[PDB]
Structures are given as structure tokens and as C-alpha cells.
Amino acid sequence: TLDVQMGRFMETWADMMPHHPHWVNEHLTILQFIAPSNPRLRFELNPAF
Amino acid sequence: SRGGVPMLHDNVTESLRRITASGGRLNPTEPLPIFGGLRPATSAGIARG
């Protein structure tokens, strides 16, 4: 309906998340996604897909 | 290389060479054994500096 599975909503967003943020990257100037050797890039890809 | 003393905070400065070593070619390791002369992995052969 929207009162229960609801806001007790975060709890079962802790079968879940405190590992902070990976492509979370959205704030600085030109370089911590254009320098040389990193875990999270094999994803944000194509002009297809 | 070694010589220091133990242990009542770790895994977040574990967020500090897993979150430190910045701005150039190649960056380091996770699990921490002890006490050696330390020949390891593969790096690079020569074009500028």
C-alpha cells in the first residue's frame, strides 16, 4: 500500500549498504576518472550499449 | 619496510593505501605479511621517466 514495507524501508536497505560509494564519483576537477590504474573502470561504456 | 608496534585501529587507514596512494602510474596492496627483502610484481619498461 505505502506505510509499512516502506520506512521501516532503510532496515531492509540493511540487508545492505555501508560500503561507501563507487561510481558515486560525481564532484571535483578533471582527475579521479582520467589517470592510470583503478578498480572501478570496466563499465561506463559504449555508443552502443 | 618494518620496525613498528601494534594494534587498536586498522581497516580504515586500510582506507588509506586501499584509500591513499594518488596521482600517477601504479598503486598498492591489501593483506600485510611481515619482515623481508621483498621482490614482487610486474611494472614497466622504458619510454620517459
Side-chain angles (χ1 to χ4, degrees):
Chain A
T1 40
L2 189 154
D3 207 64
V4 303
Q5 81 181 357
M6 187 58 207
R8 301 182 281 138
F9 171 52
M10 66 182 179
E11 292 84 3
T12 317
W13 182 52
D15 306 332
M16 186 61 68
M17 292 177 70
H19 62 266
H20 183 84
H22 89 97
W23 64 269
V24 164
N25 57 3
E26 295 295 328
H27 49 58
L28 289 84
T29 183
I30 188 66
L31 284 74
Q32 290 99 38
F33 175 72
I34 301 301
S37 71
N38 215 350
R40 63 176 288 276
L41 202 170
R42 276 83 62 195
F43 303 164
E44 180 96 23
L45 294 179
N46 215 11
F49 289 171
Chain B
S1 81
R2 323 195 92 78
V5 297
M7 206 170 312
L8 296 201
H9 294 284
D10 210 330
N11 68 7
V12 179
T13 315
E14 165 81 30
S15 80
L16 198 151
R17 167 267 299 286
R18 182 183 172 180
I19 301 188
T20 192
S22 78
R25 311 186 185 176
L26 71 163
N27 277 324
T29 67
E30 49 264 8
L32 199 71
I34 64 173
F35 177 54
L38 310 192
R39 295 292 301 272
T42 180
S43 280
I46 314 193
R48 294 181 69 87

